[PDB]
């Protein structure tokens, strides 16, 4: 976990990766590797109820998992979701992560990490 | 319903009363008297669910003087405008959060006071 600490710092110190993606709490301590997003203790609990096929929730490790972190990001995922036509800013967590948009970014994050 | 029909259609014409307050569907036949708002058949059933302390529902076809005065005092756009300008407004409120909000309370009372 040393070699890998350094990398997460690079990624954390980047695009809105130090606020929780869902609720904006500072210094998110958790991630959804799936979307390269950084979340807080509480929101990780909530993510854990979505299913691993929709969200893979870790605490700040496999190489391909770091590559997903480099590939995705808080700002990047939000920017992406905001341009989809059936985007709804009032989605529940469930609707959001079960949406076309989310699936597409997952696929994107995998394709890039590979 | 002849006096009614007239005034009711006079009110339909006022801002945004031709679409459902909640979901936006065309030509809502139902109302929540509590807010002067117009709502579709489906959403009317939804409003019966909140409880008559949060939403009193009636039909365009189903009226009292006061019930009618409340329609004049509220309105879909008026209520939305009011809501958007309260400090705690959340446009992603669920139906229960919305109608249990302070903003909803305050608009109920604007409507009652204007009515009488
Ligand atoms: Zn959070
Ligand atoms: Zn409706």
Curated annotation (Swiss-Prot), chain A:
The superkingdom listed in its UniProt entry is Eukaryota
Span of domain Arf-GAP: 5-114
Q: Where are the transmembrane segments?
A: none
| Compartment(s) | Cytoplasm; Golgi apparatus
Positions annotated as zinc finger (C4-type): 20-43
Query: Quaternary structure?
Result: Interacts with ARF1. Interacts with the COPI coat proteins, KDELR1 and TMED2. The interaction with TMED2 inhibits the GAP activity.
Anything noted about its domains? The region downstream of Arf-GAP domain is essential to GAP activity in vivo. This region may be required for its targeting to Golgi membranes.
The entry's function note states: GTPase-activating protein (GAP) for the ADP ribosylation factor 1 (ARF1). Involved in membrane trafficking and /or vesicle transport. Promotes hydrolysis of the ARF1-bound GTP and thus, is required for the dissociation of coat proteins from Golgi-derived membranes and vesicles, a prerequisite for vesicle's fusion with target compartment. Probably regulates ARF1-mediated transport via its interaction with the KDELR proteins and TMED2. Overexpression induces the redistribution of the entire Golgi complex to the endoplasmic reticulum, as when ARF1 is deactivated.
This protein is called ADP-ribosylation factor GTPase-activating protein 1
Q: Which organism is it from?
A: Homo sapiens
**Lineage per the UniProt record:** Eukaryota, Metazoa, Chordata, Craniata, Vertebrata
The coding gene here is ARFGAP1
